[PDB]
Amino acid sequence: AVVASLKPVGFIASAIADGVTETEVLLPDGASEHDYSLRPSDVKRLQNADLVVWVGPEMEAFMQKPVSKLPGAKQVTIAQLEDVKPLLMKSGDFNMHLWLSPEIARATAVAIHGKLVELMPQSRAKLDANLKDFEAQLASTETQVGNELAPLKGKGYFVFHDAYGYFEKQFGLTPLGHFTVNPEIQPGAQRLHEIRTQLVEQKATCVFAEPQFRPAVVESVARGTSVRMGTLDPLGTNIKLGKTSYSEFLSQLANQYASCLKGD
- Given the rule CB under 5 A, which residues bind Zn ion? 163
**DSSP letter for each residue of 242-256:** STTHHHHHHHHHHHH
Q: Determine the residue type at 232.
A: L
Q: In the complex, what is the shortest distance from the CB of residue 179 to Zn ion, in angstroms, rounded to a whole number?
A: 10
Q: H-helix or E-strand containing 179?
A: strand 177-180
Smaller CB separation from Zn ion, 163 or 232: 163
Smaller CB separation from Zn ion, 159 or 163: 163
Q: In the complex, what is the shortest distance from the CB of residue 33 to Zn ion, in angstroms, rounded to a whole number?
A: 5
CA dist 5 and 26 (Å) reads: 5
Is 193 annotated to bind a ligand? Reply is: no
Smaller CB separation from Zn ion, 148 or 162: 162
CA dist 20 and 113 (Å) reads: 11
Smaller CB separation from Zn ion, 163 or 260: 163
Is 22 annotated to bind a ligand? Reply is: no
Q: How far is CA 6 from CA 9, 48, 52, 80, 216, in A?
A: 5, 17, 11, 17, 25
Instruction: Find the residue with minimal CB distance to Zn ion.
Output: 163
Q: In the complex, what is the shortest distance from the CB of residue 263 to Zn ion, in angstroms, rounded to a whole number?
A: 28
Q: In the complex, what is the shortest distance from the CB of residue 220 to Zn ion, in angstroms, rounded to a whole number?
A: 19
The 10 Å CB-count burial string (b at 16+, else e) for 57-90 is: bebbebbeebbeeeeeebbbbbbebeebeeebee
Binding site, by residue number, is 33-34, 97, 161
Binding site for Zn(2+), by residue number, is 33-34, 97, 161
